[PDB]
Design a protein around this ligand. Sequence first.
Ligand SMILES: */C=C\C(=O)Nc1ccc2ncnc(Nc3cccc(Br)c3)c2c1
Length: 248
Amino acid sequence: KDAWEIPRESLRLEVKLGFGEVWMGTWNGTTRVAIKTLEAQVMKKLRHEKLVQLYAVVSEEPIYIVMEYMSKGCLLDFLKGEMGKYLRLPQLVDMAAQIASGMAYVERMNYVHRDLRAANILVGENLVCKVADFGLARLPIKWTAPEAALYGRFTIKSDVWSFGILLTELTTKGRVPYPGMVNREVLDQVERGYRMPCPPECPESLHDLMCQCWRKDPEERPTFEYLQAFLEDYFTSTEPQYQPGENL
Ligand SMILES: */C=C\C(=O)Nc1ccc2ncnc(Nc3cccc(Br)c3)c2c1
């Protein structure tokens, strides 16, 4: 056992929403938390503001992982839900920048997420977004870089790829990438060089970011550190004449 380990008595489960389940709850009475009921010492060596913070772990089984509590649920739900209607390009390019920031931190540490996509970003108060679900994590395929889906070549550079697919989620309010295409149509057509076209109302400039992120060449894709800065500066350096549209 290590120092992350706790006893269950300190854990007060409360509300189920919603591989294994996820509850809201309480830790040592004073502390509102979240529990994932189902090894993973990566959630232990990663600590950053835009990654969902581990608090404690439990095992022997039935195993409990204890995270920081994220009030608004997952980004996928949040984008398709009531909020979606009102999210506009500056909220979204910001959420992007927060995710890039967390990923830029993952980058610095020589880690790989491997399952980066909207369903794995949790949202909080004030539109805070934080990377979560290091599921698959070391040292499905519509979001997966081709070399990864094909040859198991997972790197920070295939995460950049997913990031770009996430970018399309973000700007279509949560729609499934490659609409009307099934997995084998996507794998096949991406091998031919196909890429998602500019989303409706999305600037050409941000779709280029998307295109840079989907370069066939794992190493010609950019860094998260670059993605972060370009998304932070977006409205001054890249699109300073931005004006609201009906959707974005
Ligand atoms: C987008 C679907 C999804 O994953 N759902 C989801 C909804 C709400 C929610 N609230 C709080 N926490 C989580 N997930 C979670 C992920 C990692 C660790 C922990 Br403790 C919780 C969700 C997930």
